[PDB]
Design a protein around this nucleic acid. Structure first.
Ligand SMILES: [Cl-]
Lengths: 295, 293
RNA sequence: UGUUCUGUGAACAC
RNA sequence: AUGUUCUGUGAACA
RNA sequence: AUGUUCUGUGAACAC
RNA sequence: AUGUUCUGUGAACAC
């Protein structure tokens, strides 16, 4: 009858089908499934929540798919290879700390030095505590900060450019954060997904910087991250061959990535609700099919 | 330093409440205290002000716990009536106050009886319930608010002029609104700007106006007055949990200088303040869990 | 469940 | 600028 | 991997 | 609750 809405029924059935996975999947997937299942599709507010819950479920699916294709043994080596490919370097937790402190010693006050003068400033003062220090190794550290936009660079006609630390990076805490963020950026760009615990170990040699690294990771997320993660997965699958044809999920993940995650977003049409619930249904089914058959 | 260690431990003990219950303002003020670096003199100064701030809010939270939200309106109007005052509704009060201005705008001096009749006569057509009694209660509200310059006469009715500063509607209504807020405060009632807008105007379009009034009544004396106000609430309720035990702690916290250019604390003063605020916030949590209402 | 990170606008006071 | 109140989301790890 | 040059969101060399 | 008296930062009465 005309009192029955066909879009509503497909949406409802998709959610019911997904709810069967609760009674396996990861804890984050379970939590996000529960959130979707609790959305009341008879209300406009619950329909808005269902759209965001579907997006959230989908973004988590892509993350888990990428992690399944990622070699944990080779993770550190790939990071440092990616860092070196940009002319950058990490000299170890102790030596990097000291190096960045020596950069602050030079530029805290707003002085403008040349790259050559800045490198030597650091190498000289660093050599006693760390004899391996060199113009090359310290040049790579300065390049890391350059790539991070830490410097205001002033060109001079037919001469070496002068470099000042920007006002916002003239403390150790601010400078080290941006430095850490830049290494995270390089990892992201190379399609590496590294946990806060792993990052703390890599950059500080302890597990006492999880929260600091977690803060940096979360500040680099945007609403474009879901769409970029799908493109990333495509690159991973092209590299691996794609036995399970996870490429079939592409237009579903794209649709989910195009959902507005803001809470003050325009509420969905009935067609949009059905399409989102079918998309997320297919995507979560694809993940479970992969775990069981193509592990 | 034994004083430093007690202070540090008190703050650590309080930091446990950030994990699970307390209100968002209590959480914000706990965070501020926890972030104070007690190894520095500047952080020790901040810790004293944060402890005071956290204590003043605890008194607010204690008062709110003795507050049934369903009975909040009835308790307000009961408190208003207890002072011989009255609120006749948003429409009728507006009209009444405008009629008071019609009489006294120019600086005329009328007797209370003449002023009441002036209003009742002109108000009766639009509002038939108007009376000498009901309008007398409104005039009393303005009297209690110090809106009138009163001139005594030997063996005769006193004359009353509106003070210069209240000879416009906006100024007179503000002071009128402030006086009802005052009465609520004195009866140990804590009402939000949104609730006040609804009570006094019948809409939510006067939040800011009421918020302005509330914030202007906020001074460094407020903390000490709020403690006396809680005492009145507890005397009315009987005080099963013996929240009166917190009185000298709240008094100590109320006596802290809230100015940023205040003399920095001694180690003894730091310990005492951290122990006082610890006991006070613990008293709030003990009350919520064991003596809920 | 625990341990963390992260996120919006609107008013008012000086 | 600084403060106060109200209001607003998701995410990571075991 | 390491080093050297250079005004580099990075280039070019050496071993 | 409401009303009446009154020079009330509020008193005293009635019902
Ligand atoms: Cl239907």
């Amino acid at each position: 009858n005309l009192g029955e809405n066909k879009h509503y029924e497909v949406a409802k059935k998709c959610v019911e089908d997904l709810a069967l996975y609760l009674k396996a999947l990861s804890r984050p997937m379970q939590r996000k499934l529960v959130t979707l299942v609790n959305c009341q599709l008879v209300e406009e507010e619950g329909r808005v929540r269902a759209m965001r819950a579907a997006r959230s479920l989908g973004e988590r699916t892509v993350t888990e798919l990428i992690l399944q294709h990622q070699n944990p043994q080779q993770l550190s080596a790939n990071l440092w290879a990616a860092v070196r490919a940009r002319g950058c370097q990490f000299l170890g937790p102790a030596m990097q700390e000291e190096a960045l402190k020596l950069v602050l010693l030079a530029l805290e006050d707003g002085s403008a030095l040349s790259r050559k003068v800045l490198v030597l400033f650091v190498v000289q003062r660093l050599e006693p505590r760390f004899p391996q220090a060199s113009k090359t190794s310290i040049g790579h550290v300065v390049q890391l900060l350059y790539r991070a936009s830490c410097f205001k660079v002033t060109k001079r006609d037919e001469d070496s450019s002068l470099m000042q630390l920007k006002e916002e990076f003239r403390s150790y805490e601010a400078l080290r954060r941006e430095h850490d963020a830049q290494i995270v950026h390089i990892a992201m760009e190379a399609g590496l997904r590294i946990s806060p615990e792993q990052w703390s170990s890599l950059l500080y040699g302890d597990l006492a910087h999880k929260s600091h690294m977690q803060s940096i990771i979360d500040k680099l997320q945007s609403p474009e991250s879901f769409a970029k993660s799908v493109q990333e997965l495509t690159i991973v699958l092209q590299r691996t061959g794609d036995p399970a044809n996870l490429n079939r999920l592409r237009p579903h993940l794209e649709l989910l990535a195009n959902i507005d995650p803001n809470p003050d977003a325009v509420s969905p049409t009935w067609e949009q609700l059905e399409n989102a619930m079918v998309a997320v249904k297919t995507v979560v089914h694809g993940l479970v099919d992969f775990i069981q058959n193509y592990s």
